[PDB]
Amino acid sequence: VKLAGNSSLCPVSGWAPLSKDNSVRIGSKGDVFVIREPFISCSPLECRTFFLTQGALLNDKHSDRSPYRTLMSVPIGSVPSPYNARFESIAWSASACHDGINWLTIGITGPDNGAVAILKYNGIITDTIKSWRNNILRTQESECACVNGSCFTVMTDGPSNGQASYKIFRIEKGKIVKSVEMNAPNYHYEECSCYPDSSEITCVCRDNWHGSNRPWVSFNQNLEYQIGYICSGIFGDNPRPNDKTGSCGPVSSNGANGVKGFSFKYGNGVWIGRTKSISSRNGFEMIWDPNGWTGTDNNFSIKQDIVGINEWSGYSGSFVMHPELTGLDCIVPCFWVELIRGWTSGSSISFCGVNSDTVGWSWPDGAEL
Amino acid sequence: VKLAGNSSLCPVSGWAPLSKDNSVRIGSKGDVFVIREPFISCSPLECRTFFLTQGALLNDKHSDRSPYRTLMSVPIGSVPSPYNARFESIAWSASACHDGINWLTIGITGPDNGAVAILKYNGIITDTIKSWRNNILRTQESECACVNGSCFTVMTDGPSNGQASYKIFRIEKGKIVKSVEMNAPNYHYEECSCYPDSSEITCVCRDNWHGSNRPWVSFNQNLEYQIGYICSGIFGDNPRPNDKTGSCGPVSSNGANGVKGFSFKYGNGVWIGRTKSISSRNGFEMIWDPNGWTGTDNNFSIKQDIVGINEWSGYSGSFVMHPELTGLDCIVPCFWVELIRGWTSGSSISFCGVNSDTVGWSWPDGAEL
Amino acid sequence: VKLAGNSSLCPVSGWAPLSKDNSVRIGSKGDVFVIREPFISCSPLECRTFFLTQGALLNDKHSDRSPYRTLMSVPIGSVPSPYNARFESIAWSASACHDGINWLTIGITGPDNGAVAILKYNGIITDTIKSWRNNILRTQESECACVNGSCFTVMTDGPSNGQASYKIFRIEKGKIVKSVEMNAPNYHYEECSCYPDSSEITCVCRDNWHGSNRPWVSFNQNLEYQIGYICSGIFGDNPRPNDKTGSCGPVSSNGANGVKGFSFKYGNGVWIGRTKSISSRNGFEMIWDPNGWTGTDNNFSIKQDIVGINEWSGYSGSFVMHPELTGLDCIVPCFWVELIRGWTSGSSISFCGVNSDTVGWSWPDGAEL
Amino acid sequence: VKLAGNSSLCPVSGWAPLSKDNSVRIGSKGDVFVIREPFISCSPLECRTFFLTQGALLNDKHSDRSPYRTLMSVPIGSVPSPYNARFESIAWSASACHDGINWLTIGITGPDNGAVAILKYNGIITDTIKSWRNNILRTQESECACVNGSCFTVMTDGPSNGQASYKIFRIEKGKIVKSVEMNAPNYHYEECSCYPDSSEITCVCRDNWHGSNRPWVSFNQNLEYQIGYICSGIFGDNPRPNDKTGSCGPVSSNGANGVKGFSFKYGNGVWIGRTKSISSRNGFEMIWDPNGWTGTDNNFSIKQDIVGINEWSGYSGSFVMHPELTGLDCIVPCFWVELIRGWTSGSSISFCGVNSDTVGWSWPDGAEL
Numbered sequence A, B, C, D: 001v002k003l004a005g006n007s008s009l010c011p012v013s014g015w016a017p018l019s020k021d022n023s024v025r026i027g028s029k030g031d032v033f034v035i036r037e038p039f040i041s042c043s044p045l046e047c048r049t050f051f052l053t054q055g056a057l058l059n060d061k062h063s064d065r066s067p068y069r070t071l072m073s074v075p076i077g078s079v080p081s082p083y084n085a086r087f088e089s090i091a092w093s094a095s096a097c098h099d100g101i102n103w104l105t106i107g108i109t110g111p112d113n114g115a116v117a118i119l120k121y122n123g124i125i126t127d128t129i130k131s132w133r134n135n136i137l138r139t140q141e142s143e144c145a146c147v148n149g150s151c152f153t154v155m156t157d158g159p160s161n162g163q164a165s166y167k168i169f170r171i172e173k174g175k176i177v178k179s180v181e182m183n184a185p186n187y188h189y190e191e192c193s194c195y196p197d198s199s200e201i202t203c204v205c206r207d208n209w210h211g212s213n214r215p216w217v218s219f220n221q222n223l224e225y226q227i228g229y230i231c232s233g234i235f236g237d238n239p240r241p242n243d244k245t246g247s248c249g250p251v252s253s254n255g256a257n258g259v260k261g262f263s264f265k266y267g268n269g270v271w272i273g274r275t276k277s278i279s280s281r282n283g284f285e286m287i288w289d290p291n292g293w294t295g296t297d298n299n300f301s302i303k304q305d306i307v308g309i310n311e312w313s314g315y316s317g318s319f320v321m322h323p324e325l326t327g328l329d330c331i332v333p334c335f336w337v338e339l340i341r342g343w344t345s346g347s348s349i350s351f352c353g354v355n356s357d358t359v360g361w362s363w364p365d366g367a368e369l
């Protein structure tokens, strides 16, 4: 049965540890892939960790956009190894989600001026999208959002240090049935974290051009969209300035470059996942700002520590658990964090929102390099 | 279908070898986890070995309460390897059981003053329990007991060398529906081995404070509890004095510290699993005392050898096979023994009670260190 | 349910990347088989990569027609390893297909003067064919074609540098129900790539004797056959001359030896997969010739690059995805390419025909030898 | 559904290769168990290779009746590795079969004077048999035979160089319902290969005492037994004299010691599997003697080579494929051969009887030691 996607996110007061793979620590001895850009997506049975291999193992001489890059997947918490990974697609940029029946896998491969997204429904190639700007066609590196048998994603074509072109897709059974281009001047969308919420999709993305806060786009199933920036003075991107008065436009200070991130909108509130360090991808914390989606101030109410400030962090993205998997009446918000080491490789930790008691700690990668 | 849990333990005269993994012997060459505190729990289909990894492999430079510790599981008798282990939870103290529908996993992680138990039902986080004494919240390191769709566990918070606080939980579908604190002055409960028996639960635990006999707590589904010590002069803990006249207050002699153990109450009798050595965790034997639950004498009738006195042993715990798995009219009592080597790592052997003919032997770990 | 096989190939304008295993790159560190002659076949659930192991691993002292050669299989895109490969048959020449119910595996083993094909239906030996010329009995090294519960293959017995004997088989549930010998003087058929197309089978094969174009044989379910050569001046075999005027007979120039290949007939058109280099097995491209099946000219309309001319290629073969797997109204044409390295070992890439937008690139093996 | 076991063996004219694992060749690099005494048994879905591990891997310093010995199993043709083996029982002598519902596993462990057979039905301990002579209780090292939900085996207790005691068991759902002791003076039964045939069981065994021909015992489901020797002058055991006039008392010449073997009775005929060498366990051949079960002469009609005389062979045993697995009207006879290398370890090859065309060859282990 298709995931309905019509329930709301239920409110959460903290984040509870869900998975940790210990990939690099195991890969010091075992045969473990060199992976980058991991993300989590859940079927109505299980959650799976998706990752981009380089086609190489840790502690080997074979260890950005190469033809050897493939999207693979393992059960959540298991180490990514060639003996337990399932192949998904050839991809140096990827997205994947489950509509309640089968997996949809989106894999981008090809040259920088001619990249093509290959869409797979239950392992069968069902559609392709070619690059429309011929400057690095790229996608979420996180799970697409599925509402009522339609899955949705955001793709970006154009420069990563300037104005690019952003497209929203509706995908039914692996087939593109509607695409719209976002008219967003002075905005910049990269590597969006998208989640379903009451038949709507909300994406929170990376402004690599000139934004140290995070842009967002929300749209309905007919892809009528709204855009804006997260107005909180608690800035989400990395690099970023120290916390100050925010704005609902792109904040210029330390706005160049960035990191893939996420946020969860709760009315006017927002749960913000961000690095602890404002200069490097070090540490991770979750911050509850009861007015941060629209209000410019730098006052919050809850801060939970995820990764210690002296430990390496990286990409972070959102994923959801639908009521068809949990049996609840709401959609549970969850997120993953990539812990980048170094070769360059990464492990992953994942958290889910709960209303019960939580604690902060540091769950770092822990490999002795 | 939920496990009923209303049949009684059937009487057994001996213990028959069920599984042996040979973990360290294999891990000299293969990629095998460094594991500690293994335990066994059975679904209506199969039995599974649960274990705490350190996130490290044998014969590697990465080899108590760390954020890298995770609860994992393998089919019984198989070596714990990253290529065949299923991830369960992040945990440096754990418990797990199957109510007949899905697995319930309890995983404790966090700091010593702020640890939180994360409860998972079919891989979904369903509840959390925060520490109420802020001194190392800890649990069974063995299977919880499930009666009629409710699973039960005992948790301890407080000092391990003095009076602590002990709580009994009732858990339905991963949700705590009733918890009670045990009023047990001069008692000390650690790492309880709990089993169902005629709709009631019996736990036999470790007195780390001052007790060389083993404390016990029994309770019904509404958590009305009774407490006591095992009165037999055949003492169960390790370290322990030589066998003498017992009591069922806590026996002070060699009472400090201890080892996780188990016992099976049969009316007034008791099957006692214990180390052969009274000073170290060496050897293992099963002793049938027909009056040992209530009587203070040191006379028994059956002794079966499990591990030889010159071989290393360790933690031991109980698990059961419900009639829904065996097709019998009784609940079969079974137990595992951890064989600790050294890094510090452990293999496991497991036995099940039968009324047919048995033999004693030594089934040690066998790795040449 | 049996695959009907009665729909036609749907027209395609390009080829989209489907799988890439990165076998040798992984096998530099992991335990990966030394494999040769891989091919792909799909069940109504999944596609599988079949391969001939030498019974040896990469980077080992143990690394054509040996008794240690076995046919094995893995899920598509996964590395061929002894820990995830399924054993299929003992074979130094093989074919395999799925009729919609069970796998049919054909495995040839034995001496050069006495080889016997062993037919297996769902792992059970169901029939054998002995050699009728006693000079290396051999088969497709690609998937057999199944129409309406009957699977079809072509076998060759006799010299590979001269006139041999070619037989077409009809196989129902692993049992040979009809075989016919092809009366084909001056023709030479080796390692045929066969596909179903509207209840009929079309095979495109290798002329190792005197042909640099590719011979073909088409037949109905009663094995009434037609034969010919692909008339296009775009020659398909390797070694081959430079493109010139073709012929519907065997083209003598550079006609000796060859490589296993494929083609897809579309009325009078043909999709030709071939090496880029005319002298060695280097590179790969797909060429659309709208009249190439019957017309002798060297003019085409579409050329898509698959493997770069400086990268090693090898055997190529065809496979299909039936409507019972894709849910479409047509049979999707697909092909694989073996990338040969060096020991001698090979990885594999695979493509499927689509009518959407595609790009050319190079997806080579990538191992640093 | 239970296997009926009431059809007859259908006549076969040759033996076709079924599986070959290439264990030692792979284990030079990969993590492959050191195994001994492999055997094959088939469920109504699949066939499985059962083997006794030493709890040690090839190419490791950890590499007869030890407590570390365990019965494990893999799918047929796959290498025995800790990452794909299923644990079955603790055992230094074993037997296993499938009654059509679940696996029955028999595992003998314990000391030489106190060994106990542990019977497991679907992984649950269901019965035990203790040693009745206290001199190495031992069993088939091959598959038990199941007829109509009852599985049958032969066990031996007593000296291996003299008169011992032999018992036939009937086992229903893992429970012994009838055992009978064979009154067999001057006979010696070791490591019987038993097969069902028209609701009756026939076992062909090893005379380690004074017999170079092979003893046999046949019995119905009520264990009314008949005994004898194979009267053919084609002797089956190894060591053995050169072929001469036989008898069906025990043939004294070279009668001491032996090797586990098998034979298939076809009325008065017999298919004899035996080593080529009369002094060592070298080579293997299958010999059809149309009167060899009862007639003393040394004339046969068919000889098929299995393993070359310069290659190592070892234990050989029989297994069957029931009509519920093949869909045929008869029970297909099949056999395996262990190829012993050296540590001491072994690979396995397996053959099934067919009435189609076969060839002889050598399929040796092939590891370069």
Ligand SMILES: CCC(CC)O[C@H]1[C@H](NC(C)=O)[C@@H](N)C=C(C(=O)O)[C@H]1NC(C)=O
Pocket: A037, A064, A065, A092, A093, A136, A138, A160, A190, A191, A208, A258, A259
């Ligand atoms: C700005 C997004 C994007 C623009 C192309 O770059 C991504 C890159 N994505 C791709 C498709 O290569 C990803 N592999 C990881 C990155 C990273 O670690 O920051 C980014 N790299 C740089 C140099 O910013």
Ligand SMILES: CCC(CC)O[C@H]1[C@H](NC(C)=O)[C@@H](N)C=C(C(=O)O)[C@H]1NC(C)=O
Pocket: B037, B064, B065, B092, B093, B136, B138, B160, B190, B191, B208, B258, B259
């Ligand atoms: C007394 C129980 C408990 C009190 C905290 O200590 C456990 C410990 N449990 C935890 C939660 O760390 C466990 N890993 C193993 C132990 C062991 O091998 O004896 C114990 N260690 C010591 C120093 O006694």
Ligand SMILES: CCC(CC)O[C@H]1[C@H](NC(C)=O)[C@@H](N)C=C(C(=O)O)[C@H]1NC(C)=O
Pocket: C037, C064, C065, C092, C093, C136, C138, C160, C190, C191, C208, C258, C259
């Ligand atoms: C001409 C086909 C065939 C004739 C016997 O030879 C095949 C060979 N097939 C067999 C059955 O051995 C295959 N392993 C690979 C080949 C290759 O890489 O070209 C061929 N080898 C040579 C020397 O041409």
Ligand SMILES: CCC(CC)O[C@H]1[C@H](NC(C)=O)[C@@H](N)C=C(C(=O)O)[C@H]1NC(C)=O
Pocket: D037, D064, D065, D092, D093, D136, D138, D160, D190, D191, D208, D258, D259
């Ligand atoms: C005669 C059967 C039996 C009598 C005890 O001995 C078996 C042995 N079986 C057991 C139970 O150990 C088996 N592992 C392999 C043997 C072998 O390779 O020949 C035999 N060994 C010797 C010394 O003959």
Ligand SMILES: *[C@@H]1O[C@H](CO)[C@@H](O)[C@H](O)[C@H]1NC(C)=O
Pocket: A004, A006, A007, A008, A329
């Ligand atoms: C979502 O829709 C389903 C039917 O599609 C309905 O049963 C359910 O109540 C809806 N839930 C909410 C929260 O609106």
Ligand SMILES: *[C@@H]1O[C@H](CO)[C@@H](O)[C@H](O)[C@H]1NC(C)=O
Pocket: B004, B006, B007, B008, B329
């Ligand atoms: C346990 O309860 C079930 C119903 O829940 C009943 O059928 C069964 O007989 C009971 N068993 C015992 C041993 O009391």
Ligand SMILES: *[C@@H]1O[C@H](CO)[C@@H](O)[C@H](O)[C@H]1NC(C)=O
Pocket: C004, C006, C007, C008
């Ligand atoms: C193929 O046969 C089936 C019957 O199984 C029929 O329904 C189908 O329409 C046929 N295909 C075409 C293209 O007509």
Ligand SMILES: *[C@@H]1O[C@H](CO)[C@@H](O)[C@H](O)[C@H]1NC(C)=O
Pocket: D004, D006, D007, D008
């Ligand atoms: C075997 O038994 C089944 C029923 O158990 C019966 O249908 C079948 O005819 C029997 N076969 C023979 C050959 O007796």
Ligand SMILES: [Ca+2]
Pocket: A206, A207, A208, A209, A210, A211, A212, A237, A238, A239, A254, A255, A256, A257, A258, A259
């Ligand atoms: Ca930025």
Ligand SMILES: [Ca+2]
Pocket: B206, B207, B208, B209, B210, B211, B212, B237, B238, B239, B254, B255, B256, B257, B258, B259
């Ligand atoms: Ca104590």
Ligand SMILES: [Ca+2]
Pocket: C206, C207, C208, C209, C210, C211, C212, C237, C238, C239, C254, C255, C256, C257, C258, C259
């Ligand atoms: Ca040629």
Ligand SMILES: [Ca+2]
Pocket: D206, D207, D208, D209, D210, D211, D212, D237, D238, D239, D254, D255, D256, D257, D258, D259
């Ligand atoms: Ca003998």
